Design a protein around this ligand. Structure first.
Ligand SMILES: CCCCCCCCCCC=O
Length: 149
C-alpha cells in the first residue's frame, strides 16, 4: 500500500516555457509536502518559491477533479496529475494557464529530500520528453534549493 501523502522535496523540473522556471519565476517550486485528502477530495501543497531573491512559503489547497486530475490556483490556473509514484519518488505533470492565457506544460520529480535515485530520474526525463519538453529545459532544483526545511 503506497503512501503518497507526506514529505516531498523537488529535485528536477522540466517546462515547455523557460520563463516560468528560471530564477525567481513562479514555477521554480521547492516542494516541502503534499497531502492527499481523498475523503474530502482535496490536496494540500506546501512549498517555497523565490521572489526578489528571498524565500516565500506557500500553502495551497487544490480540489480533485475528473480522473486523477487536481485543480489549484497559483500564477494562473493549474491542472496537475501524479503521473508516477514509487516509494522514493513522485512525478507531477502540470498544465498552467497564466493570467495572460499562455499555456505551459511542466513536469517535476519529487523525493524524500535526499538523494536522487537514478531510476526515478530516468522516468522523470522520459515523462518530460513525452510531454514534448526538451532536455535543455530541465533545471536542477536541489542545487537551487537553499530555502528553509
Ligand atoms: C509546481 C510543479 C511541481 C511541484 C511539486 C508538487 C506540486 C505542488 C504545487 C503545484 C502547483 O502547481
Amino acid at each position: 500500500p503506497f503512501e503518497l501523502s507526506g514529505k516531498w522535496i523537488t529535485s528536477y523540473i522540466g517546462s515547455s516555457d523557460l520563463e516560468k522556471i528560471g530564477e525567481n519565476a513562479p514555477f521554480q517550486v521547492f516542494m516541502r509536502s503534499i497531502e492527499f485528502d481523498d475523503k474530502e477530495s482535496k490536496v494540500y501543497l506546501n512549498f517555497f518559491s523565490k521572489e526578489n531573491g528571498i524565500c516565500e512559503e506557500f500553502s495551497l489547497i487544490g480540489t480533485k477533479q475528473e480522473g486523477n486530475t487536481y485543480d489549484v490556483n497559483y500564477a494562473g490556473n493549474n491542472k496537475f496529475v501524479v503521473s508516477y509514484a514509487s516509494e522514493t519518488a513522485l512525478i507531477i505533470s502540470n498544465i498552467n494557464v497564466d493570467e495572460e492565457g499562455d499555456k505551459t506544460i511542466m513536469t517535476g520529480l519529487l523525493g524524500k529530500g535526499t538523494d536522487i535515485e537514478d531510476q526515478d530520474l530516468e522516468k522523470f526525463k522520459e515523462v518530460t520528453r513525452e510531454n514534448g519538453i526538451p532536455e535543455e529545459n530541465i533545471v536542477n532544483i536541489i542545487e537551487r534549493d537553499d530555502c528553509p526545511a
